[PDB]
CSV table of C-alpha atoms in Angstrom, one decimal:
chain,number,residue,atom,x,y,z
A,1,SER,CA,93.7,120.7,83.7
A,2,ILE,CA,93.8,123.9,85.8
A,3,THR,CA,91.9,127.0,84.8
A,4,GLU,CA,92.2,130.6,86.1
A,5,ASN,CA,89.1,132.0,87.8
A,6,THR,CA,89.6,135.7,87.8
A,7,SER,CA,86.7,136.5,90.1
A,8,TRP,CA,88.5,134.7,92.9
A,9,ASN,CA,91.0,137.5,93.1
A,10,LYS,CA,88.2,139.7,94.7
A,11,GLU,CA,88.9,138.0,98.0
A,12,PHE,CA,92.7,138.8,97.8
A,13,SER,CA,92.4,142.5,96.6
A,14,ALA,CA,90.5,143.5,99.7
A,15,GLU,CA,93.4,142.6,102.0
A,16,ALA,CA,96.1,143.5,99.5
A,17,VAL,CA,97.2,139.9,99.7
A,18,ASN,CA,99.7,138.4,97.2
A,19,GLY,CA,98.7,134.7,97.2
A,20,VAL,CA,97.2,131.7,95.4
A,21,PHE,CA,94.3,129.3,96.0
A,22,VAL,CA,94.0,126.0,94.1
A,23,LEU,CA,90.8,124.1,94.4
A,24,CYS,CA,90.1,120.7,92.7
A,25,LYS,CA,86.8,118.8,92.5
A,26,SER,CA,87.0,115.0,92.6
A,27,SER,CA,90.5,114.8,91.4
A,28,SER,CA,93.6,116.8,90.5
A,29,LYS,CA,92.5,116.7,86.8
A,30,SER,CA,89.8,119.2,87.5
A,31,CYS,CA,91.4,122.3,89.2
A,32,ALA,CA,90.9,126.1,89.3
A,33,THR,CA,93.0,128.9,90.7
A,34,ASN,CA,93.0,132.7,91.0
A,35,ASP,CA,96.6,132.8,89.7
A,36,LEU,CA,98.0,130.3,87.2
A,37,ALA,CA,101.5,131.6,87.5
A,38,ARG,CA,101.7,131.4,91.3
A,39,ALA,CA,99.9,128.1,91.4
A,40,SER,CA,103.1,126.2,90.4
A,41,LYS,CA,105.6,128.6,92.1
A,42,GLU,CA,107.4,126.8,94.9
A,43,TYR,CA,107.7,128.0,98.6
A,44,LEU,CA,109.0,126.7,101.9
A,45,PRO,CA,106.4,124.2,103.1
A,46,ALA,CA,106.9,125.2,106.8
A,47,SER,CA,104.6,123.2,109.1
A,48,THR,CA,102.7,121.7,106.1
A,49,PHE,CA,105.8,119.4,106.0
A,50,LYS,CA,104.4,117.7,109.2
A,51,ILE,CA,102.2,115.6,106.8
A,52,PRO,CA,105.0,113.8,105.0
A,53,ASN,CA,107.3,113.9,108.1
A,54,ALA,CA,104.6,112.0,110.1
A,55,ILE,CA,104.1,109.4,107.4
A,56,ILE,CA,107.9,108.9,107.1
A,57,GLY,CA,108.3,108.7,110.9
A,58,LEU,CA,105.7,105.9,111.0
A,59,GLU,CA,107.1,104.1,107.9
A,60,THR,CA,110.6,104.0,109.4
A,61,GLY,CA,109.5,103.0,112.8
A,62,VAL,CA,110.7,106.2,114.4
A,63,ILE,CA,107.1,106.8,115.5
A,64,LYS,CA,105.8,103.5,117.0
A,65,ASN,CA,102.1,103.8,116.1
A,66,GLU,CA,99.3,106.3,116.5
A,67,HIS,CA,99.3,106.1,120.2
A,68,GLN,CA,102.8,107.2,120.8
A,69,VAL,CA,103.0,110.0,123.3
A,70,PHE,CA,105.7,112.7,122.9
A,71,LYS,CA,106.7,113.6,126.4
A,72,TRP,CA,107.8,117.1,127.2
A,73,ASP,CA,111.2,117.3,128.9
A,74,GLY,CA,110.2,120.5,130.8
A,75,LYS,CA,112.7,122.6,128.9
A,76,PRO,CA,111.6,125.8,127.2
A,77,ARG,CA,109.9,125.7,123.8
A,78,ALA,CA,109.1,128.6,121.5
A,79,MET,CA,105.4,128.4,122.1
A,80,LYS,CA,103.6,127.7,125.3
A,81,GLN,CA,101.2,125.5,123.5
A,82,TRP,CA,104.0,123.1,122.9
A,83,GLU,CA,105.1,122.8,126.6
A,84,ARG,CA,103.2,119.7,127.4
A,85,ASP,CA,103.0,116.0,126.5
A,86,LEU,CA,101.4,115.5,123.1
A,87,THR,CA,100.0,112.7,121.0
A,88,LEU,CA,100.9,112.4,117.4
A,89,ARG,CA,97.6,114.1,116.4
A,90,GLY,CA,98.2,116.8,119.1
A,91,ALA,CA,101.7,117.5,117.9
A,92,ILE,CA,100.5,117.9,114.3
A,93,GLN,CA,97.5,120.0,115.2
A,94,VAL,CA,99.4,122.5,117.5
A,95,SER,CA,102.3,122.4,115.0
A,96,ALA,CA,104.8,121.4,117.6
A,97,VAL,CA,108.0,122.0,115.7
A,98,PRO,CA,110.5,120.5,118.3
A,99,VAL,CA,108.7,117.2,118.2
A,100,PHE,CA,109.1,116.9,114.5
A,101,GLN,CA,112.6,118.2,114.5
A,102,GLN,CA,113.6,115.2,116.7
A,103,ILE,CA,111.6,112.8,114.4
A,104,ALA,CA,113.5,114.2,111.4
A,105,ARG,CA,116.9,113.7,113.1
A,106,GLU,CA,116.0,110.0,113.9
A,107,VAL,CA,114.7,109.5,110.3
A,108,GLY,CA,118.0,110.9,109.0
A,109,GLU,CA,119.0,112.4,105.7
A,110,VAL,CA,119.3,109.3,103.7
A,111,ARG,CA,115.8,108.0,104.5
A,112,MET,CA,114.3,111.5,104.3
A,113,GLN,CA,115.7,111.9,100.8
A,114,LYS,CA,114.4,108.5,99.7
A,115,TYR,CA,110.8,109.2,100.9
A,116,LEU,CA,110.6,112.7,99.4
A,117,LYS,CA,111.6,111.2,96.1
A,118,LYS,CA,108.9,108.5,96.4
A,119,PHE,CA,106.4,111.2,97.3
A,120,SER,CA,107.4,113.6,94.5
A,121,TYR,CA,107.7,116.3,97.1
A,122,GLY,CA,108.6,119.6,95.6
A,123,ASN,CA,112.2,120.3,94.7
A,124,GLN,CA,113.2,117.5,97.1
A,125,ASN,CA,116.1,119.6,98.5
A,126,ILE,CA,116.6,118.9,102.1
A,127,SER,CA,119.8,120.9,102.5
A,128,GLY,CA,119.9,123.4,105.4
A,129,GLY,CA,120.2,121.0,108.3
A,130,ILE,CA,118.1,117.8,108.9
A,131,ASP,CA,116.0,119.5,111.5
A,132,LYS,CA,115.3,122.8,109.7
A,133,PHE,CA,115.2,122.2,105.9
A,134,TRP,CA,111.4,122.8,105.7
A,135,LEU,CA,111.5,125.8,108.0
A,136,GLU,CA,114.5,127.8,106.8
A,137,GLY,CA,116.3,125.6,104.4
A,138,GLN,CA,116.2,124.9,100.7
A,139,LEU,CA,113.0,122.8,100.4
A,140,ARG,CA,110.3,124.3,98.2
A,141,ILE,CA,106.8,123.0,97.0
A,142,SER,CA,104.0,124.6,95.1
A,143,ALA,CA,100.2,124.7,95.8
A,144,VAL,CA,99.6,122.4,92.8
A,145,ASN,CA,102.1,119.9,94.2
A,146,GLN,CA,100.5,120.0,97.6
A,147,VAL,CA,97.1,119.1,96.0
A,148,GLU,CA,98.8,116.2,94.1
A,149,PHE,CA,100.4,114.9,97.2
A,150,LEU,CA,97.2,115.2,99.3
A,151,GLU,CA,95.2,113.4,96.6
A,152,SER,CA,97.6,110.5,96.8
A,153,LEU,CA,97.3,110.4,100.6
A,154,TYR,CA,93.5,110.5,100.3
A,155,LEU,CA,93.6,107.6,97.9
A,156,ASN,CA,96.2,105.7,100.0
A,157,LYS,CA,98.5,105.8,96.9
A,158,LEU,CA,101.6,107.1,98.6
A,159,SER,CA,104.6,104.7,98.9
A,160,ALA,CA,103.7,103.9,102.5
A,161,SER,CA,101.5,101.4,104.3
A,162,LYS,CA,97.8,102.0,104.1
A,163,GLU,CA,97.7,101.8,107.9
A,164,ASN,CA,100.2,104.7,108.2
A,165,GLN,CA,98.3,106.8,105.7
A,166,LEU,CA,95.1,106.2,107.6
A,167,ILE,CA,96.8,107.2,110.9
A,168,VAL,CA,98.0,110.5,109.5
A,169,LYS,CA,94.7,111.2,107.9
A,170,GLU,CA,92.8,110.9,111.2
A,171,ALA,CA,95.4,113.2,112.8
A,172,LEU,CA,94.5,115.9,110.2
A,173,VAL,CA,90.7,116.0,110.8
A,174,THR,CA,89.8,119.6,111.8
A,175,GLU,CA,86.0,119.8,111.1
A,176,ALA,CA,83.5,117.0,111.5
A,177,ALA,CA,79.8,116.6,110.9
A,178,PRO,CA,77.7,113.6,109.6
A,179,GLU,CA,78.0,114.5,106.0
A,180,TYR,CA,80.9,117.0,106.1
A,181,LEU,CA,84.5,116.3,107.0
A,182,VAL,CA,87.6,118.5,106.6
A,183,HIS,CA,91.3,117.3,106.8
A,184,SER,CA,93.7,120.2,106.8
A,185,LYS,CA,97.1,121.6,107.9
A,186,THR,CA,98.4,125.1,108.3
A,187,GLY,CA,101.9,126.4,107.8
A,188,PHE,CA,103.8,129.8,108.6
A,189,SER,CA,107.5,130.3,107.9
A,190,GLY,CA,107.7,133.6,109.7
A,191,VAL,CA,107.5,137.2,108.7
A,192,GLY,CA,110.8,137.5,106.8
A,193,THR,CA,111.1,141.2,105.7
A,194,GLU,CA,109.2,143.6,103.6
A,195,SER,CA,111.4,142.8,100.6
A,196,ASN,CA,111.6,139.1,101.3
A,197,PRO,CA,108.4,138.1,103.1
A,198,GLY,CA,107.5,134.8,104.8
A,199,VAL,CA,104.9,132.4,103.6
A,200,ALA,CA,101.7,131.1,105.1
A,201,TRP,CA,99.8,128.1,104.0
A,202,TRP,CA,96.5,126.2,104.5
A,203,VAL,CA,96.2,122.8,102.7
A,204,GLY,CA,93.8,119.9,102.8
A,205,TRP,CA,90.6,118.4,101.5
A,206,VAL,CA,86.9,118.7,102.2
A,207,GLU,CA,84.4,115.8,101.9
A,208,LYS,CA,80.9,117.1,101.5
A,209,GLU,CA,78.2,114.4,101.0
A,210,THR,CA,79.8,112.1,98.3
A,211,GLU,CA,82.0,114.7,96.8
A,212,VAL,CA,85.7,115.5,97.6
A,213,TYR,CA,87.5,118.8,97.0
A,214,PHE,CA,91.3,119.1,97.4
A,215,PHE,CA,92.8,122.5,98.2
A,216,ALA,CA,96.0,124.5,98.7
A,217,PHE,CA,96.5,128.1,99.7
A,218,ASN,CA,99.6,130.2,100.2
A,219,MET,CA,100.3,133.8,100.6
A,220,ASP,CA,103.2,136.2,101.2
A,221,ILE,CA,103.2,137.5,104.8
A,222,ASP,CA,105.3,140.2,106.5
A,223,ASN,CA,102.9,141.0,109.4
A,224,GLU,CA,101.8,138.3,111.8
A,225,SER,CA,98.5,140.0,112.3
A,226,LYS,CA,97.4,138.9,108.8
A,227,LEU,CA,97.8,135.2,109.6
A,228,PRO,CA,94.1,134.3,109.8
A,229,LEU,CA,93.7,135.1,106.1
A,230,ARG,CA,95.3,131.8,105.3
A,231,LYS,CA,92.1,130.2,106.4
A,232,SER,CA,89.5,132.9,105.8
A,233,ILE,CA,90.3,133.6,102.2
A,234,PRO,CA,90.1,129.9,101.1
A,235,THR,CA,87.0,129.4,103.3
A,236,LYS,CA,85.3,132.4,101.7
A,237,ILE,CA,86.1,131.1,98.2
A,238,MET,CA,85.0,127.6,99.1
A,239,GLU,CA,81.7,128.8,100.7
A,240,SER,CA,81.0,130.9,97.6
A,241,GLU,CA,81.2,127.6,95.6
A,242,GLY,CA,78.7,125.9,98.0
A,243,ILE,CA,81.4,124.0,99.9
A,244,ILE,CA,80.1,124.4,103.4
A,245,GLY,CA,78.7,122.2,106.1
B,1,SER,CA,87.8,97.0,139.0
B,2,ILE,CA,84.5,98.8,138.3
B,3,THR,CA,83.3,101.0,141.1
B,4,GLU,CA,79.9,102.5,141.9
B,5,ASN,CA,79.3,106.2,142.2
B,6,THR,CA,75.7,106.7,143.3
B,7,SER,CA,76.1,110.4,143.5
B,8,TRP,CA,75.7,110.3,139.7
B,9,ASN,CA,72.0,109.3,140.1
B,10,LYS,CA,71.2,113.0,140.7
B,11,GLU,CA,71.9,113.6,137.0
B,12,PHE,CA,69.2,111.1,135.9
B,13,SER,CA,66.5,111.7,138.5
B,14,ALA,CA,66.3,115.3,137.8
B,15,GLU,CA,65.3,114.6,134.3
B,16,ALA,CA,62.9,111.6,134.5
B,17,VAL,CA,65.4,109.0,133.6
B,18,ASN,CA,66.2,105.4,134.5
B,19,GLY,CA,69.6,104.7,133.0
B,20,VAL,CA,73.3,104.0,133.4
B,21,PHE,CA,76.6,105.6,132.5
B,22,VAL,CA,80.0,103.7,132.5
B,23,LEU,CA,83.2,105.8,132.3
B,24,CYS,CA,86.7,104.4,132.2
B,25,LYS,CA,90.0,106.3,132.3
B,26,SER,CA,92.9,104.8,130.3
B,27,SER,CA,91.5,101.3,130.2
B,28,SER,CA,88.6,99.1,131.1
B,29,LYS,CA,90.5,98.2,134.3
B,30,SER,CA,89.6,101.6,135.8
B,31,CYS,CA,85.8,102.1,135.4
B,32,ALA,CA,83.1,103.8,137.3
B,33,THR,CA,79.3,103.7,137.0
B,34,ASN,CA,76.2,105.1,138.7
B,35,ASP,CA,74.6,101.6,138.9
B,36,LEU,CA,76.6,98.4,138.9
B,37,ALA,CA,73.5,96.3,138.3
B,38,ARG,CA,72.3,98.2,135.2
B,39,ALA,CA,75.9,98.5,133.9
B,40,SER,CA,75.9,94.7,133.3
B,41,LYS,CA,72.3,94.4,132.1
B,42,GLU,CA,72.1,93.8,128.3
B,43,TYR,CA,69.9,95.9,126.0
B,44,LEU,CA,69.2,96.0,122.2
B,45,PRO,CA,72.1,97.8,120.6
B,46,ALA,CA,70.1,99.5,117.9
B,47,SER,CA,72.3,101.7,115.7
B,48,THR,CA,75.4,101.2,117.9
B,49,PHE,CA,75.5,97.9,116.1
B,50,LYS,CA,76.7,99.9,113.0
B,51,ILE,CA,80.2,99.7,114.5
B,52,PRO,CA,80.7,95.9,114.4
B,53,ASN,CA,78.5,95.7,111.3
B,54,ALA,CA,80.8,98.1,109.4
B,55,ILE,CA,83.9,96.3,110.5
B,56,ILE,CA,82.4,92.9,109.5
B,57,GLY,CA,81.3,94.4,106.2
B,58,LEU,CA,84.8,95.5,105.4
B,59,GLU,CA,86.4,92.2,106.6
B,60,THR,CA,84.2,90.1,104.5
B,61,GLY,CA,84.6,92.3,101.4
B,62,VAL,CA,80.9,93.2,101.4
B,63,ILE,CA,82.1,96.8,101.8
B,64,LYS,CA,85.0,97.4,99.3
B,65,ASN,CA,87.0,100.1,101.1
B,66,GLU,CA,86.7,103.5,102.9
B,67,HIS,CA,85.6,105.2,99.7
B,68,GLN,CA,82.7,103.1,98.7
B,69,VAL,CA,79.6,105.1,97.9
B,70,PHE,CA,76.2,103.6,98.8
B,71,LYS,CA,73.9,104.8,96.1
B,72,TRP,CA,70.2,105.4,96.5
B,73,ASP,CA,68.1,103.5,94.0
B,74,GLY,CA,65.4,106.1,94.1
B,75,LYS,CA,62.9,104.1,96.1
B,76,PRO,CA,61.4,105.8,99.2
B,77,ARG,CA,63.1,105.3,102.6
B,78,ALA,CA,61.6,105.6,106.1
B,79,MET,CA,63.3,108.9,106.2
B,80,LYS,CA,64.2,111.5,103.6
B,81,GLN,CA,67.5,111.9,105.4
B,82,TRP,CA,68.5,108.6,103.8
B,83,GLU,CA,67.2,109.2,100.2
B,84,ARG,CA,70.6,110.2,99.1
B,85,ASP,CA,73.9,108.7,98.1
B,86,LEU,CA,76.1,108.2,101.2
B,87,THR,CA,79.7,107.4,102.0
B,88,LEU,CA,80.6,104.9,104.7
B,89,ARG,CA,81.0,107.7,107.2
B,90,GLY,CA,77.7,109.2,106.1
B,91,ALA,CA,75.9,106.0,106.4
B,92,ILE,CA,77.1,105.5,109.9
B,93,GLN,CA,76.5,109.0,111.1
B,94,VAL,CA,73.0,109.7,109.7
B,95,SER,CA,72.3,106.2,110.9
B,96,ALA,CA,71.1,104.9,107.5
B,97,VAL,CA,69.2,101.7,108.1
B,98,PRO,CA,68.7,100.2,104.6
B,99,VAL,CA,72.3,100.5,103.9
B,100,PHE,CA,73.2,98.4,106.9
B,101,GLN,CA,70.3,95.9,106.3
B,102,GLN,CA,71.7,95.1,102.9
B,103,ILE,CA,75.2,94.8,104.4
B,104,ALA,CA,73.9,92.3,107.0
B,105,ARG,CA,72.1,90.3,104.3
B,106,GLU,CA,75.2,90.0,102.2
B,107,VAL,CA,77.4,89.1,105.2
B,108,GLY,CA,74.9,86.3,106.2
B,109,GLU,CA,74.0,84.6,109.5
B,110,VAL,CA,77.0,82.2,109.6
B,111,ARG,CA,79.6,84.8,109.1
B,112,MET,CA,77.8,87.4,111.3
B,113,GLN,CA,77.7,84.8,114.1
B,114,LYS,CA,81.4,84.0,113.7
B,115,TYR,CA,82.5,87.6,114.0
B,116,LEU,CA,80.2,88.4,117.0
B,117,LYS,CA,81.9,85.4,118.7
B,118,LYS,CA,85.3,86.8,117.9
B,119,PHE,CA,84.3,90.3,119.1
B,120,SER,CA,82.6,88.9,122.3
B,121,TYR,CA,79.6,91.0,121.4
B,122,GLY,CA,76.9,90.8,124.0
B,123,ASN,CA,74.6,87.7,124.1
B,124,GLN,CA,75.6,87.0,120.5
B,125,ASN,CA,72.0,86.2,119.7
B,126,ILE,CA,71.2,87.2,116.2
B,127,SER,CA,67.8,85.6,115.8
B,128,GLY,CA,65.0,87.9,114.7
B,129,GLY,CA,65.9,88.2,111.0
B,130,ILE,CA,69.3,88.8,109.6
B,131,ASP,CA,68.4,92.4,108.7
B,132,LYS,CA,66.8,93.4,111.9
B,133,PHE,CA,68.3,91.4,114.9
B,134,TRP,CA,69.9,94.6,116.3
B,135,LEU,CA,66.8,96.7,115.8
B,136,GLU,CA,63.9,94.3,116.8
B,137,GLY,CA,65.5,91.0,117.5
B,138,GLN,CA,67.1,89.1,120.3
B,139,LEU,CA,70.6,90.7,120.4
B,140,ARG,CA,71.5,92.4,123.6
B,141,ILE,CA,74.7,94.0,125.0
B,142,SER,CA,75.6,95.7,128.2
B,143,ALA,CA,77.3,99.1,128.8
B,144,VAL,CA,80.3,97.3,130.2
B,145,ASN,CA,80.5,95.1,127.2
B,146,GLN,CA,80.3,98.2,124.9
B,147,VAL,CA,83.3,99.8,126.7
B,148,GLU,CA,85.3,96.5,126.4
B,149,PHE,CA,84.5,96.3,122.7
B,150,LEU,CA,85.3,99.9,122.0
B,151,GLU,CA,88.6,99.7,123.9
B,152,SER,CA,89.5,96.7,121.7
B,153,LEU,CA,88.7,98.8,118.6
B,154,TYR,CA,90.7,101.8,119.9
B,155,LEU,CA,93.7,99.5,120.4
B,156,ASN,CA,93.3,97.7,117.1
B,157,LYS,CA,92.8,94.4,119.0
B,158,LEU,CA,89.6,93.2,117.4
B,159,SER,CA,89.9,90.2,115.1
B,160,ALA,CA,90.0,92.3,112.0
B,161,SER,CA,92.7,94.1,110.0
B,162,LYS,CA,94.2,97.2,111.5
B,163,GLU,CA,93.3,99.0,108.3
B,164,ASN,CA,89.6,98.2,108.6
B,165,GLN,CA,89.6,99.2,112.3
B,166,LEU,CA,91.2,102.5,111.3
B,167,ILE,CA,88.6,103.1,108.6
B,168,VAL,CA,85.7,102.6,110.9
B,169,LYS,CA,87.4,104.7,113.6
B,170,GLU,CA,87.6,107.8,111.3
B,171,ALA,CA,84.0,107.3,110.4
B,172,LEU,CA,83.1,107.6,114.1
B,173,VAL,CA,84.8,111.0,114.7
B,174,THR,CA,82.1,113.4,116.0
B,175,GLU,CA,84.0,116.2,117.6
B,176,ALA,CA,87.5,117.5,116.8
B,177,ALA,CA,89.8,120.1,118.3
B,178,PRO,CA,93.7,120.0,118.4
B,179,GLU,CA,93.9,118.3,121.8
B,180,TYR,CA,90.3,116.9,122.1
B,181,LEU,CA,88.9,114.2,119.8
B,182,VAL,CA,85.6,112.3,120.2
B,183,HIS,CA,84.7,109.0,118.5
B,184,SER,CA,81.0,108.2,119.2
B,185,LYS,CA,77.8,106.5,118.1
B,186,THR,CA,74.2,107.0,119.1
B,187,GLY,CA,71.5,104.4,119.1
B,188,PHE,CA,67.7,104.4,119.8
B,189,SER,CA,65.3,101.5,119.5
B,190,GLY,CA,62.2,103.6,119.5
B,191,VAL,CA,60.0,105.5,121.9
B,192,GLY,CA,58.3,102.9,124.1
B,193,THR,CA,55.7,103.3,126.6
B,194,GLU,CA,56.1,104.0,130.3
B,195,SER,CA,55.6,100.3,131.0
B,196,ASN,CA,57.6,98.9,128.1
B,197,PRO,CA,60.3,101.5,127.3
B,198,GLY,CA,62.6,101.7,124.4
B,199,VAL,CA,66.4,102.1,124.9
B,200,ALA,CA,68.6,104.9,123.8
B,201,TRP,CA,72.4,104.8,123.8
B,202,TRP,CA,75.5,107.0,123.4
B,203,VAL,CA,78.9,105.2,123.3
B,204,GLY,CA,82.4,106.1,122.4
B,205,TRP,CA,85.6,107.5,123.7
B,206,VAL,CA,87.2,110.8,124.3
B,207,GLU,CA,90.9,111.6,123.7
B,208,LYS,CA,91.8,114.7,125.8
B,209,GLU,CA,95.4,115.8,125.7
B,210,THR,CA,97.3,112.5,126.3
B,211,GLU,CA,94.5,110.7,128.2
B,212,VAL,CA,91.7,108.5,126.9
B,213,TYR,CA,88.2,107.9,128.4
B,214,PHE,CA,85.9,105.2,127.2
B,215,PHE,CA,82.2,105.6,127.8
B,216,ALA,CA,78.8,103.9,127.4
B,217,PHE,CA,75.4,105.4,128.3
B,218,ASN,CA,71.9,103.9,128.0
B,219,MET,CA,68.5,104.9,129.3
B,220,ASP,CA,64.9,103.9,129.1
B,221,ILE,CA,62.9,106.1,126.7
B,222,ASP,CA,59.2,106.5,127.0
B,223,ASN,CA,58.9,110.1,125.7
B,224,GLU,CA,60.2,111.4,122.4
B,225,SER,CA,61.3,114.7,124.0
B,226,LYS,CA,63.8,113.0,126.3
B,227,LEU,CA,66.0,111.7,123.5
B,228,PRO,CA,68.7,114.4,123.8
B,229,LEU,CA,69.4,113.4,127.4
B,230,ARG,CA,71.4,110.5,125.9
B,231,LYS,CA,74.1,113.1,125.2
B,232,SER,CA,73.4,115.7,127.9
B,233,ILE,CA,73.5,113.4,130.9
B,234,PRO,CA,76.9,111.9,129.9
B,235,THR,CA,78.2,115.3,129.1
B,236,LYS,CA,77.2,116.7,132.5
B,237,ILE,CA,78.9,113.8,134.3
B,238,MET,CA,82.0,114.1,132.2
B,239,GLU,CA,82.1,117.8,132.9
B,240,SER,CA,81.9,117.2,136.6
B,241,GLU,CA,84.9,114.9,136.2
B,242,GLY,CA,86.9,117.7,134.6
B,243,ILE,CA,87.0,116.0,131.2
B,244,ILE,CA,85.1,118.6,129.1
B,245,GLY,CA,86.8,121.9,130.2
B,246,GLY,CA,89.8,123.0,132.0
């Protein structure tokens, strides 16, 4: 049961951001958001899709194990940060699209469709090209569905081996302290246009002491300069709730 | 095979210390140390023993899974740091004794002995009391053996399920950046005296870009103020090797 916390809009009004934050304590049965309507509205997942794509790559054997190195062929890539050999974790953490485009091609449409049905992943529409459906195609997922999916992963309840779920979880670690641990992933589809803006995401979970909080944030974005808000707005909200290391 | 780099002794002498650092690139077939003799000398593992103990706990079913919460009964602990409920990761990282003493008791001496044989864990001598052999007992392990054991864990080659090895590995993450990840564990037997020192440890591995480095450090400790050197000396050596920065 999700409730609407109107005070959480304060953090969005300052930057004139149209977006949504969903935060759940312990389980997805206890959630709150700044915007009930937008919470279940579906958007391109962009690089947040690297989470299911990595699990599927491991499940199908396309990715051998957690120590696979994705070698760079020396050919130009869109971001300099991607122009190097990367581990599975590195490729996820730097959001190396071309690595995951090749994984998706090797998985193929039939297997991709099967796993997204098992994972209950959004509208499950992978039309738009096997290497671009999550970037510019027809796939859509809401913030609420992201939290449901992440909770499954946290609990090892996805239809995949526990080993493969654990591998992907360590790849998502982004903040670590003795009694505080964050697993998270960003996404950014691009800037679209003023009338049809892009979308930016931050999704994950926080473990503080013996509690766990699942979260998903998205926002409309038409100016790349606003990108950091995808982390700072959720972080400010979480810190205001005492979720801090 | 392991080579000696005496130029590293500088980093220890400056600060009072008698100790050893072992550092290996890619595998334990490419290792270097400041002191070959001390690299193979065996010392009490102290809380570095939480690594095998946790794996054994999971393998035997004593620890249920990665999400088990170790609840505090309310009775006082040596430290207030531990008078709280802890996850497995928390119990490893705040180095919560009583949690691991109970795990050891439940595992029992016969099973504990069996797993330390499978893991080739030091002198495999667990006499001294089942809940204190790694803290005050007869168990000893060298820095070289620590690296070998950690490399096996990294590769999922210990005699344990891959799932349980993965669970324990996430619990050991202590630093995280996109292309830099550290798994590590400290240990400290106590502050001894100048003539009968305690031992302090830092062991782990660093994944930097697509390379991996295994490490194990120990030092004699006879002054409480010197404890942080267990991280700063290895850090300085690793920085000199180009691992830390760029």
